[PDB]
Paper text:
The APOBEC3 family of enzymes ([name]-A3H) forms part of the innate immune response against viruses and transposons. Its single-stranded DNA C-to-U editing activity results in multiple mutagenic outcomes including signature single-base substitution mutations (isolated and clustered), DNA breakage, and larger-scale chromosomal aberrations. Here, we use X-ray crystallography to determine high-resolution structures of wildtype [name]/hairpin-inhibited complexes and demonstrate the underlying mechanism of inhibition.
Here we reveal the structural basis of competitive inhibition of wildtype [name] by hairpin DNA bearing 2′-deoxy-5-fluorozebularine in place of the cytidine in the TC substrate motif that is part of a 3-nucleotide loop. The catalytic glutamic acid residue, Glu72, which functions as a general acid/base, hydrogen bonds to C4-OH and N3-H of hydrated [name]. The 5-fluoro group of [name] is accommodated comfortably, abutting Tyr130. These results with wildtype [name], together with prior work indicating hydration of dZ and its derivatives in structures with CDA and A3G, combine to demonstrate a universal mechanism of target nucleobase engagement, deamination, and inhibition.
Residue numbers in the entry: 10 to 41, 49 to 63, 66 to 196
Write the structure that this text describes.
DNA sequence: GCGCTTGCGC
């Protein structure tokens, strides 16, 4: 019942233009959807050091009360591919290792290649047993339906959503193909 | 506010 502003979503998860911010929408499904929601990064503003959207998720993981003797799948739809350089990639892996009853699924709207260590981040997450993928129309539409406060208005894709989505999917497969 | 947007400039 905490929903995102339409303009926020469409100007953040768009895959042709970027923002100086990151959003992460998450779901938790037990296996044999318990919790959902979304958050954004804390901006580094020295005049703090910032906190990436990934690390904020791990911070709230205790509040989700995951039964240690049950199996969960966690899904992120994240506006930027996770970084390596600021340590997001390492910490997620560390968390996955220390838990192991959690299985993770990550869809990114665009690749954070500003980090020149982006290839190592994605491959490091894949090796940890995360699924790393590019968001398509269906994942955008599902996030729209599930987290955006649309007031009953169905998802309207932006121009060239698919060209971009395929081009990025192409890039990511090349990276993970090792 | 204001811009252009892979927080920073003004
Ligand atoms: Zn990061």
């Amino acid at each position: 019942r905490h929903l995102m502003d339409p303009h926020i979503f469409t100007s953040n998860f768009n895959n042709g233009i970027g923002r100086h911010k990151t959003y992460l929408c998450y779901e938790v499904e037990r296996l044999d959807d318990q919790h959902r929601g979304f958050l954004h990064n804390q901006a580094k503003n020295l005049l703090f050091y910032g906190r990436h959207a990934e690390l904020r998720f791990l911070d709230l993981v205790p509040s989700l009360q995951l039964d240690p003797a049950q199996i969960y799948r966690v899904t992120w739809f994240i506006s930027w591919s996770p970084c390596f350089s600021w340590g997001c990639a390492g910490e997620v892996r560390a968390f996955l290792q220390e838990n192991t009853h959690v299985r993770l699924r990550i869809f990114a709207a665009r690749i954070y290649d500003y980090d020149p260590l982006y290839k190592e981040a994605l491959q490091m997450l894949r090796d940890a047993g995360a699924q790393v993928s590019i968001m398509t129309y269906d994942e955008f539409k599902h996030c729209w339906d599930t987290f955006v406060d649309h007031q009953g208005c169905p998802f309207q894709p932006w121009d060239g959503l698919d060209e971009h989505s395929q081009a990025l999917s192409g890039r990511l497969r090349a990276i993970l193909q090792n």
